[PDB]
Structure 1
Amino acid sequence: EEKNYHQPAILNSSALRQIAEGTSISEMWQNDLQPLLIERYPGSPGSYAARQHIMQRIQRLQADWVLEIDTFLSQTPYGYRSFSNIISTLNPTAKRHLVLACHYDSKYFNNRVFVGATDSAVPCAMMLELARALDKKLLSLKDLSLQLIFFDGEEAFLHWSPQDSLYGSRHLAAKMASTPHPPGARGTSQLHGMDLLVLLDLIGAPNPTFPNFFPNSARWFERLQAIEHELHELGLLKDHSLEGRYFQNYSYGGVIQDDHIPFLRRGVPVLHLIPSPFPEVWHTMDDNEENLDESTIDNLNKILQVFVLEYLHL
């Protein structure tokens, strides 16, 4: 309905510089990102500490985020285990929400530990830094708002299959599909109030190239392209080339499995910020803090924060 005709309020140069300046890559690194770089596969003590970190960093902000933990047991190749997706919503009774999402588990695995630095500590920390950098503007919103989702159990425990993967997202898309929205309404569920799902995944590697995956989000991907482009021209990006842009005029010809899968196949539009090709380090012990690129991530935070403000008209 409205989602289909919704237009961004495009911000001027002055307002661009403000967004570029009001985000801190170093704050994100030390306060949002470093505490997540721990083994945190589903049900582990590392999972719990990560969950606690996420909630804590969320609670500390004046915007009136409403947190909710969707916990549940699912059969795994290692028997029943516990999962906990984390939902942070502003204005939970607002009809429409822009949704941001990462998976916050790490994949269960040299006498080294897998910490999924791109996969996906960085996407989560970016979500966190967005919530902090925009706090004051998000505070004003207190019938479209913002939701953050951190999915648990994205990864296969053993071998990626329909039943061994995406435990978090598949359980939550279904919860949301059978839950009336707004509360005490008839016919319409919580998925239906999902304007757009923007899934960040595998972000942090140098020189990422993000395809335009879905016609029904193509105009939103376009907005990312114009945004990168304008932040670039204003000298607000770092180590940034037009020839090496993140957001390319490229469509993708395969199907990627990820947390958007159970929302997409129920008709939620998806803007899938996963690069192709996948980072050199993907599903290797090398996916660590060392192999991450500061300026890339700093840059994408600014593209992303602008995208978000424009969508919310903020």
Structure 2
Amino acid sequence: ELVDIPKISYNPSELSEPRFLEYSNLSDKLHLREAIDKILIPRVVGTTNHSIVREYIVQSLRDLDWDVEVNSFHDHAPIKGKLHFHNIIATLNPNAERYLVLSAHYDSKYMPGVEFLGATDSAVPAAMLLNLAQVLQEQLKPLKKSKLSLMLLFFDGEEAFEEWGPKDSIYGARHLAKKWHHEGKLDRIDMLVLLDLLGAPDPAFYSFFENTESWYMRIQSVETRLAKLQLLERYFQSQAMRSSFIEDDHIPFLRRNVPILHLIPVPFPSVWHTPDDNASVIDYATTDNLALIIRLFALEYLL
């Protein structure tokens, strides 16, 4: 299962001390909390709430001068039948040649009679991405015009409607990876960074994929550097995990040799797919720290 990551993959934080200090002190706690609050509502595909959450994501980023495409399509799910799914694709430069993609799923799992909020899964991850664009507004402006740019991708229909299987999960990612495959729009992904199950306490991360192990070690180094500077209020292990075959929105991209960085803890939060994955499970020290590490990774990668 676990192997120590070899030195060849170490990839220390590169930002200059003044820039690392400057950027690591950018935050917006209130906005992060407000974004969480707006998304932390039952949001099953096809519900009014599902549309409201899409609108909030869409308008938040449009107001930050991002280009936002909504990829709408129909597909049949068990129980529900014909559903209208809506992936959200936000770019700072819509005419960039290449992208770092940060992603999370915005739907919540259909759990009859239970108003499942999916706080970690993935209300908090989506919020971290809105918060990232909000916090780093100034520093990301250059990426509106550059060849390498940033994409925030919000997947729809990640969750199963009946029982998690290859045909009853990741509805939006399966459609989009297929669509981009056909349109020749997958090679442009430097890597797809997928945030999932974040916001609960004591997350442990591991590198899942050897072609991105090096950029995992850049996040690990960001975390180390922040610890040393007293900027955190450890998560990333210097170990990789093989034959874990965790299924999520990345799979249809992974299958087609898009490099994945899967930011999902192992073990999953204890409250996973229970009603306790709600407002009360969110650890806001952990959430602030993770959001920061991810914001700095993004800046490390993109400059």
TM-score by length of 1: 0.89
Question: 1:93 maps to which residue?
Answer: 95
Choose the corresponding residue for 1:158, options 139, 153, 162: 162
Q: Which amino acid aligns with 1:263?
A: F
Distance 2:229 2:38 in 1: 33
Distance 1:194 1:8 in 2: 22
Give CA-to-partner distance per residue, 1:70-124, whole Å, 9 cap, x none: 0110011121111000000121221110000000000000964101000001000
Question: 1:171 maps to which residue?
Answer: 175
State the number of aligned residues: 289
Question: 1:47 maps to which residue?
Answer: 50
2:102–2:152 Cα contact (<8 Å) kept = yes
Distance 1:33 1:307 in 2: 21
Which SS does the other structure have where 1:38 is aligned? coil
Q: Indicate whether 1:270 and 2:273 are aligned.
A: no
Q: Indicate whether 1:34 and 2:23 are aligned.
A: no
1:90–1:146 Cα contact (<8 Å) kept = yes
Give CA-to-partner distance per residue, 1:219-273, whole Å, 9 cap, x none: 00100111100001000001xxxxxx11002222311000000001100000000
Q: Indicate whether 1:248 and 2:243 are aligned.
A: no
Give CA-to-partner distance per residue, 1:253-299, whole Å, 9 cap, x none: 31100000000110000000000000011000000111110011111
Distance 2:108 2:67 in 1: 25
Q: Cα–Cα, structure 1 residues 263 and 148, in superposed 2: closer, same or farther, change >3 Å?
A: same
Choose the corresponding residue for 1:118, options 108, 120, 126: 120
Cα root mean square deviation, aligned: 1.4
Which region of structure 1 is more displaced relative to structure 2, 213-222 or 16-25? 16-25
Large movers: runs of 4+ above 3 Å: none
Q: Which amino acid aligns with 2:218?
A: R
Which SS does the other structure have where 1:232 is aligned? helix
Which SS does the other structure have where 2:279 is aligned? coil
Which SS does the other structure have where 2:61 is aligned? helix
TM-score by length of 2: 0.92
Which SS does the other structure have where 1:72 is aligned? strand
Question: 1:83 maps to which residue?
Answer: 85
2:38–2:53 Cα contact (<8 Å) kept = yes
Q: Indicate whether 1:235 and 2:227 are aligned.
A: no
Q: Which amino acid aligns with 1:250?
A: Q
Which region of structure 1 is more displaced relative to structure 2, 105-114 or 196-205? 105-114
Distance 2:113 2:187 in 1: 46
Alignment of 1:96-245 (within 5 A): 96-109=98-111, 112-141=114-143, 142=145, 143-179=147-183, 189-238=184-233, 245=234
Q: Indicate whether 1:280 and 2:270 are aligned.
A: yes
**Seq. identity, %:** 49
2:13–2:221 Cα contact (<8 Å) kept = no
Which SS does the other structure have where 1:93 is aligned? coil
Unaligned runs of 5+ in 2: 1-10
Choose the corresponding residue for 2:294, options 299, 304, 307: 304
Question: 1:57 maps to which residue?
Answer: 60
Deviation at 1:12, TM superposition (A): 2.4
Question: 1:184 maps to which residue?
Answer: none
Deviation at 1:210, TM superposition (A): 0.8
Deviation at 1:8, TM superposition (A): 8.8
